[PDB]
């Protein structure tokens, strides 16, 4: 009751409802901006919900599965824009995370908001699809977009990629088919380059992407450690 979670200056009933709302909004819009503390708590709920959904999907035990389903239902507000949220959770969202052991969200810190000095953050779903089956781009996966923008900038400058950038790319890849990842990167480039107004010679960009993928995939002192005399 003290120390188990953030209190967030709200009465228990209100607080829980707020958290549910945040979770619903995260599932609907695959990224959302909010205050840092709220985002942190919301992540805990959303991740829990995702795991329960995964458990329901997997389990052979019928009673267990039913219980998981009931728990998931309890943890959401299913109305208006979130009428078919349960369906989405089972069919669209939870199947992304079957291999991933936890860590389905990422809270990314922003510059604190000016009017309030409140620490601001971006709660968002990990490995959200950047491109739907229709020829559009999807709202979400901000980190990936940022990475690709950084890559583009490095290419423009004719500089080597930073170790941190490479590490991030590797992390992104870990639960991604290589060809799919490449195609996503290419798609992101097309939009990003146009926005920034750099020229998109396609074959060269593809080659660069391929090169970036290759280095990611193929893995390759002051004090001396000496035994006791």
């Amino acid at each position: 009751t003290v120390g188990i979670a953030r209190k967030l200056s709200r009465d228990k009933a209100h607080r829980d409802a707020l958290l549910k709302n945040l979770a619903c909004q995260l599932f609907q819009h695959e990224s959302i901006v909010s205050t840092h503390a709220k985002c942190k708590e919301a992540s805990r709920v959303a991740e829990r919900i995702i795991t329960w959904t995964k458990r329901a999907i997997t389990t052979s035990n019928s009673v267990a599965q039913a219980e998981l389903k009931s728990q998931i239902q309890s943890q959401l507000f299913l109305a208006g824009d979130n009428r078919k949220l349960m369906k989405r959770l089972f069919s669209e969202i939870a199947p992304r995370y079957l291999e991933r052991p936890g860590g389905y969200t990422r809270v990314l810190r922003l510059e604190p908001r000016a009017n309030d000095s409140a620490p601001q953050s971006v709660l968002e779903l990990v490995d959200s699809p950047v491109m739907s089956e229709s020829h559009t781009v999807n709202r979400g996966n901000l980190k990936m977009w940022l990475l690709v923008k950084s890559v583009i900038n490095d290419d423009a400058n004719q500089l080597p990629h930073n170790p941190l950038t490479l590490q991030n790319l590797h992390k992104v890849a870990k639960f991604k088919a290589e060809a799919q990842l490449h195609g996503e990167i290419m798609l992101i480039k097309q939009v990003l380059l146009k926005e920034m107004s750099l020229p998109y010679d396609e074959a060269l960009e593809n080659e660069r992407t391929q090169a970036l993928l290759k280095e990611v995939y193929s893995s390759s002192s002051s004090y001396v450690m000496v035994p006791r005399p």
Binding site: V137, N157, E195
Partner: protein, 112 residues
């Protein structure tokens, strides 16, 4: 409960500015953004790049505006007859001039 004397210039100033707690600190923890080579806070996203990405998302993931057929195919004269102009209130006018009271985000300096 109540101050016994007029607090002097010295004693108010040493109270306010003497302690380091009360002073402002240099923001040493700035560093370069990898997407655009500009200043940003450490362990923080660049507000320009994330803003740009948000804008891109908005432009792509855009719910189409509902233009009713009957109003779209009105004649100009007919439209004027139906929906004439009006004097807006002082309050309304003030609300309309958003650039007076609404702060757009500033761009940081380019890192060296």
């Amino acid at each position: 409960a109540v101050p016994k004397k007029k607090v002097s210039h010295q004693k108010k100033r040493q109270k306010l500015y003497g302690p380091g707690k009360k002073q402002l600190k240099m923001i040493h923890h700035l560093n370069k953004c990898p997407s655009c080579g500009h200043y940003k806070r450490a362990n923080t996203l660049c507000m320009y790049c994330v803003g740009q990405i948000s804008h891109i998302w908005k432009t792509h993931t855009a719910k189409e505006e509902i233009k009713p057929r009957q109003e779209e195919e009105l004649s100009e004269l007919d439209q004027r007859v139906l929906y004439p102009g009006r004097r807006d209130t002082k309050y309304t006018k003030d609300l309309k001039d958003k650039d007076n009271y609404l702060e757009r985000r500033v761009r940081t300096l380019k890192k060296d």
